[PDB]
Amino acid sequence: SMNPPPPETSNPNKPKRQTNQLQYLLRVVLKTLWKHQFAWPFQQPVDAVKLNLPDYYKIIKTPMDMGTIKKRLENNYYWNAQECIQDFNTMFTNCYIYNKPGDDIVLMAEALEKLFLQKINELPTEE
Numbered sequence: 001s002m003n004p005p006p007p008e009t010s011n012p013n014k015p016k017r018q019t020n021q022l023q024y025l026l027r028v029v030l031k032t033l034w035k036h037q038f039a040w041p042f043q044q045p046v047d048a049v050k051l052n053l054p055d056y057y058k059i060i061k062t063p064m065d066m067g068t069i070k071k072r073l074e075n076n077y078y079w080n081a082q083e084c085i086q087d088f089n090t091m092f093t094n095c096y097i098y099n100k101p102g103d104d105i106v107l108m109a110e111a112l113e114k115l116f117l118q119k120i121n122e123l124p125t126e127e
């Protein structure tokens with residue numbers, strides 16, 4: 001069994017921009033989610049080999065996790081906040097697609113998403 005390569009986190013051809021919104025996404029949003037008691041499964045890509053989930057990457061074709069998001073924020077991969085917000089949403093929706101309502105991992109994702117949306121409500125206006 002094999003895992004796919006992780007999502008891209010470095011590309012010198014992709015234009016980059018540091019914005020106050022992206023800085024908030026790293027300093028407030030990512031940091032707040034990372035320390036939550038339910039963050040740990042989401043801090044790195046799903047290792048479907050070690051978890052014995054051989055169909056995972058047959059169902060989830062846009063993998064995303066907060067370890068990748070952290071790297072993208074810390075390595076200035078993004079042009080805008082919407083790209084980063086989309087990554088968080090991809091992570092949550094993957095979990096809801098692959099698993100059943102009320103499953104433990106779904107409850108964990110939902111707790112993180114509730115917190116994420118609360119933080120997004122305070123996203124600062126662009127400079």
Ligand SMILES: O=c1cc(N2CCOCC2)oc2c(-c3ccccc3)cccc12
Nearest residue numbers: 041042046047051053094095098099105
């Ligand atoms: O969608 C997912 C399904 C699961 N699975 C299926 C249910 O049993 C446990 C493994 O695991 C996930 C994990 C994870 C769970 C436990 C340990 C490490 C990572 C992290 C992110 C998403 C998923």
